[PDB]
Amino acid sequence: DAELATRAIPELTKLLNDEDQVVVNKAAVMVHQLSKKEASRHAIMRSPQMVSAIVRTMQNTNDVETARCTAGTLHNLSHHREGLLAIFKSGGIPALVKMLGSPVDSVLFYAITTLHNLLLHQEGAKMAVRLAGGLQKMVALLNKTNVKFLAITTDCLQILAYGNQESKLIILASGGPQALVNIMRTYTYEKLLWTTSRVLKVLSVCSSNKPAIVEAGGMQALGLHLTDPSQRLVQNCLWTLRNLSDAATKQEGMEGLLGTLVQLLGSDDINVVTCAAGILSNLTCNNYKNKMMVCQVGGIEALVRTVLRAGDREDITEPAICALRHLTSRHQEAEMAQNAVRLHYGLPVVVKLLHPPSHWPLIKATVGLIRNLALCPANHAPLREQGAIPRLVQLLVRAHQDTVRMEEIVEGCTGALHILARDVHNRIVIRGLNTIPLFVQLLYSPIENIQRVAAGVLCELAQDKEAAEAIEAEGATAPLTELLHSRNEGVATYAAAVLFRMSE
Template sequence: KMAVRLAGGLQKMVALLQRNNVKFLAIVTDCLQILAYGNQESKLIILASQGPVELVRIMRSYDYEKLLWTTSRVLKVLSVCSSNKPAIVEAGGMQALAMHLGHPSQRLVQNCLWTLRNLSDAGTKVDSMEALLQSLVTLLASSDLNIVTCAAGILSNLTCNNQRNKVTVCQVGGVDALVHTIVNAGDREEITEPAVCALRHLTSRHVESEMAQNAVRLNYGIQVIVKLLHPPSRWPLIKAVIGLIRNMALSQANHGPLCENGAIHHLVRLLMRAFQDTQRQRASVASSGSQPSNVYADGVRMEEIVEGTVGALHILARESHNRTIIRQQNVIPIFVQLLFSEIENVQRVAAGVLCELATDKEGAEVIEHEGATAPLTELLHSRNEGVATYAAAVLFRMSEDKPQDYKKRLSMELTNSLFREDQNLWAGGDLGMPPDLQDMLEPDQMLDAMYSQGPPSVHSSHGGRPFSQSGGY
């Protein structure tokens, strides 16, 4: 192999890809695969010789199964190389591979899927994906678990932060198919995690999102999804499920079924566990004097679980029956503690859920009793508009039955702090409380940031690696 590389054999082989004898081309592509596998230098030589463009052209131009298979194997090896990946995507590689997903040859379909999965985190901004997305939704019904795993992983990546792809997947029955996939997968997390992530993307921030939120319920998905919060689910899956439940709660019609299936109870249980883990870590840092570090479990930060569970409870607390259940869970002390968090997003969701709970007199009394007034007053000066506005709203709601002079003093304090930061924060500056704080803050827009950090390949595969890194070298 080394001798061939040193003699310039790779460049010569890439040049031969322009021939049109399919059997000869199958031999050439087979040689390229052998030389490129596990050798980064060879991959870069193939790239510099315009290999990706030629390989994609072959996938588009021929129907000889052996040639398509050997070519897809070269593309699979190149697709894990960060330099080749964008070149393959730019050459139209994803659309070319999509052409063969209905092929009777299982080995060809599987190689195309592995390659597409590796490319999919670089392909989130590519247009003309309709045919690929339709094929992937169809493949979710396959009896081959490898095919289902790949299809779910690709759908998850391609629906991340891409409104057009989200709408397409919804329109071709993707929500129903993903729910059925999760039901059939049982505890196979290599399938349930990407499928839940895909549903999480489909239930948020696009024109069909409300339809998707309701479709999960109509396909009897709520019971199965809440069940995934139980053991033996690992943290990456639990994190994805929390985000999905939060999005589902944006639809009023889902509140009853979520509550009946114990969603609030499980979210509170997970919050308490994650909160205790972060507190324990903080205590050990304080006693040993070492540098503070994040608490991870299976590659997931416990602060993310805290933020996610509180964010979901915030949306669920819009409904009065849910607020009663949350109050009964004795979790308000934790929400108040979270106002002291150094993480702005955690402060925001904590102030947000308290804002909802303070709507009821009983809730406002418990919040005040737990000593929230001081941290909330401090948060009025937060640079984060959402944090400051929620803090103001909680204080305002807590003052409902206070004497008039107290209310007047609070009113002045709120005016001074909020107007110092932003003249337009309160519409018209009238502190009679804006009619609907949610509309102004749009928490469903804001909270998505937590789940879209890192590479577009938002879900991890086992061991916390993004799906995009698996399969081939």
């Protein structure tokens, strides 16, 4: 069987080396229609004699029936690791990519099939096509229409992406993302969407290029398939949107995407809820154009319940607590969003997350959220009767006695007593825990924003009579008097307003 070509092989090599571009064309066809034999393709393989001659004849031809059979051999040889090694050694890779510069898809399919098999098999072939300029062509090859073609070209761009930060920018340089997301908002085929998603997912793991797909509409197109029945896909369409969320904060025309996300917060896979609660956190950090869209679709309802699903788990807790904070500061439906937390029974599950086993970053967002919630004074009465002002004042000491920075809490944990002191009974509860020496201690901090919220909870506290008969001791009727000269002005204002309500 195979003992035939094992000696007839060197014959066909010589006739390939000939000059006449007809005694080499149809001669190479003889090699192909023999490669259809798993017994004798082994013989073409085992001896890498013409393995160069096939490669060499490919990039030195002008007839199309040549390349139809020429590269087809290279395909029909990728079926075993034995052959792959020969194709790399024979310099085929910086030549197989030249066939990507053809319109005849019969050549292109046979070509990109080999390049796919090499990457997901042949070691040491990544550095190859990276340098044969194929990163350009593979992108520019995303004009064709044969679903399975673009489903392979996108995958060959995945391996050539997960690795070097430099291989991506070629994709960022020539159409790339704007031609990529086109494959996501025009094609029904499922496998191609998943293959394309891993590309867009990999491209989104460095802030250097994240603001490129977003301007290309990547958030919009990726929002189309969030509901797609292929669950093995949506988990890629989500991790991408979580990384991208640092760019669409200042982007418009993206509304309905949120509406499909706020719904997913009550789904089966706890994975999706986690990434979904994160997608809404960074899509809200400083932008009251998305916020109002989240509220009028029941965002607060969807989040309090989601905060209540887990509780002890913190992968869910942070991006939802840190979300509700964004939906409770500087926007139109502010007061309503501060109300809606209470009506939907939020106050408990919020103050509960102050207590352990919760760790520091969640406690940051929670403390900031309680400052936010206290703006509608209806929220004061429960927080007082919820066991909150204590665990605030202790957390402050936990972050104080040793002075993310604990000082970032000392500010927010005091600045939440300032929006809490605007209620009458809470000023007694603060006064009751015998804390006035600590707020006075804070003023001496020569930092900055800590100066403000310190005097803030004192300025609110001193409106009553007995605070003058208390803060005037301990050592305040002088350090504030040597603070009015502060460069910061809201810091000076507060540092003075205390000094007033003390004389009479």
